[PDB]
Amino acid sequence: ITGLVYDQRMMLHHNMWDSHHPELPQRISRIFSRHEELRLLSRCHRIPARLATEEELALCHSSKHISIIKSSEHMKPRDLNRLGDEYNSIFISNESYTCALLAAGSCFNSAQAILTGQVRNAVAIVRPPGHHAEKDTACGFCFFNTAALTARYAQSITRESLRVLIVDWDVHHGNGTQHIFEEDDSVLYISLHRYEDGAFFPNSEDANYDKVGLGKGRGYNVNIPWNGGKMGDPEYMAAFHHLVMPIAREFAPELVLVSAGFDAARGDPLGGFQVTPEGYAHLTHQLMSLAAGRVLIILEGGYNLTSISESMSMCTSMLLGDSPPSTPLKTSATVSINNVLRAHAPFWSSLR
Amino acid sequence: XXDXXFXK
Ligand SMILES: [K+]
Ligand SMILES: [K+]
Ligand SMILES: [Zn+2]
């Protein structure tokens, strides 16, 4: 059985000064509608949304950060503008905190449904996104790091050191996820992202291939950065073939979380890449060979409404067991993949 | 508009 969580209340988070800001309420309703149209919704077990608790947010975030975002629930517009402007790329409304709680709690219920055996896998149609949120700050349209929190929540109901793989295929580097787990060998973070030597958001060398983790976490952070090319299905398939899947098999995770942004999709106004819905289906199908199929797909970014609706629907089709649907790499993608292989061969025998 | 992620 495949689980699905979606709650229209997450649409209430909005940009009161710029109604055309790309992190649109209708991102999630358009994805949900397309699941209905393609007759995928009726094939899924509907998992209820819920609010994360503040205790659960403290799995990854400081009490100061939690209390600041919480206080925005009661702010007047001038103070919402001032607070949001203190962060890198954040807008806040009075509903933002609640929606961020619903996004996280929905993913907790999905992870719980998988780990109690109610469903084999699941998809979470949630906003605002999470992967740029840091322990102490909001960032990049994200308030709390939903995927990072879900990994810790999964560990909290099974084994403190349960091996969790987070694959972040949003076109942006998940700086927050990397940092939260950078010293941790129980959570393997693998990010593919446009990088452009730091010109692409989040504009930090933290996203480069030589950032491999720290302390006992050394080797458990895998950055696959793209430079100088409009990447697409061939490049993402090659990165999965040479890097993501061999490393993941060696790690042997018990749960796979996908930070599934769809802004590397053909048509995305921010990403500039051309991964197709069929491409995302093949990526999902490969991940389903891990963790006895225990895969939770969490919406992150993705800003072309048609693109994200078709792409995420294709992912759910794969989770449901449908057959996957039916080219040389850009030369700089070969360079990137080889750079990551050189960086990580000391840690993963499958790369030697 | 000086928003890092939108490049606007
Ligand atoms: K990413
Ligand atoms: K890690
Ligand atoms: Zn993104």
Q: Which residue of B has its CA nearest to A171?
A: B5
Residue A22 touches chain B, beta carbons under 8 Å: yes
Among the listed residues A96, A105, A49, the one whose alpha carbon sits nearest the alpha carbon of residue A71:
A96
> Count of alpha carbons within 13 Å of A170, Cβ hemisphere only?
31
Beta-strand relationship, A121-125 and A295-299: parallel
* Structure-block tokens of residue A302: 């993705």
Structure tokens given for A31: 């994805």
Nearest to A174, CA basis, from A315, A301, A308, A291: A301
Q: Residue A245 corresponds to which tokens in the numbers above?
A: 């899947």
Helices marked H in A122-191 — which ranges?
146-156, 175-180
Distance CA A192, CA A50 (A): 30
Nearest to A149 by CA among A187, A114, A120, A97: A187
Q: With a CB-CB cutoff of 8 Å, which residues 1-8 of chain B face chain A?
A: 3-7
Name the structure determination technique.
Answer: X-ray
Residues in chain B: 8
Touching B: A residues 47-106, CB under 8 Å? 88-89
Phi and psi angles of residue A94, each rounded to the nearest 5 degrees, phi first: -65, -20
Resolution, angstroms, 1 dp: 1.7
Rounded to the nearest angstrom, the gap between the alpha carbon of residue A343 and the centroid of all alpha carbons in its chain is 23
B2 contacts on A by Cβ (under 8 Å): none
Do A285 and A324 touch, CB atoms closer than 8 A? yes
Q: Report the sign of the C-alpha dihedral through residues A131, A135, A137, A143, in that order.
A: positive
Chain B positions in Cβ-Cβ contact with residue A15 (cut-off 8 Å): none
CB within 8 Å of chain B, chain A residues 202-261: 202-203
Secondary structure string (H, E, C) spanning A275-340: ECHHHHHHHHHHHCCCHHHCEEEEECCCCCHHHHHHHHHHHHHHHCCCCCCCCCCCHHHHHHHHHH
Phi-psi sector, A95: left (phi>0), alpha (psi -120 to 50), beta = alpha
Chain A residue numbers touching B7 (CB-CB < 8 A): 201, 270
- State the Cα–Cα distance between residues A193 and A217, nearest whole angstrom: 21
Could you tell me the end-to-end alpha-carbon distance of chain B, in angstroms, rounded to an integer? Answer: 4
At A200 the three-state DSSP class reads coil
CA distance A124 to A297: 6
Radius of gyration of chain A (CA): 18
Q: Which site among B4, B5, B6, B8 would you substitute to test the A interface, given the most A Cβ atoms closer than 10 Å to its Cβ?
A: B5
Q: How many CB atoms lie within 10 A of CB A293?
A: 14
- Report whether A172 belongs to an annotated binding site: yes
Provide the pairing of β-strand A45-46 with A221-226.
Answer: unpaired
Q: How far apart are the first and last CA of chain A?
A: 37
Spatial separation of the C-alpha atoms in residues A35 and A43, rounded to whole Å: 10
CB within 8 Å: A89 and B6? yes
Spatial CB neighbours of A158, under 8 Å, sequence gap ≥ 6: A115, A254
Alpha-carbon A233 to chain mean position: 18
- Minimal CA separation from A85 to chain B, in Å: 10
Q: Which two tokens stand for residue A51?
A: 């609010």
Active site residue A179: no
Q: How far is the CA of A106 from the centre of ligand 2 (A)?
A: 24
* 3-class state of residue A114 by DSSP: helix
Asked whether the beta carbons of A19 and A266 are under 8 A apart, the reply is no
Radius of gyration of chain B from Cα atoms?
4
Per-domain boundaries in chain A: 1-352
- For residue A8, the SS3 value is helix
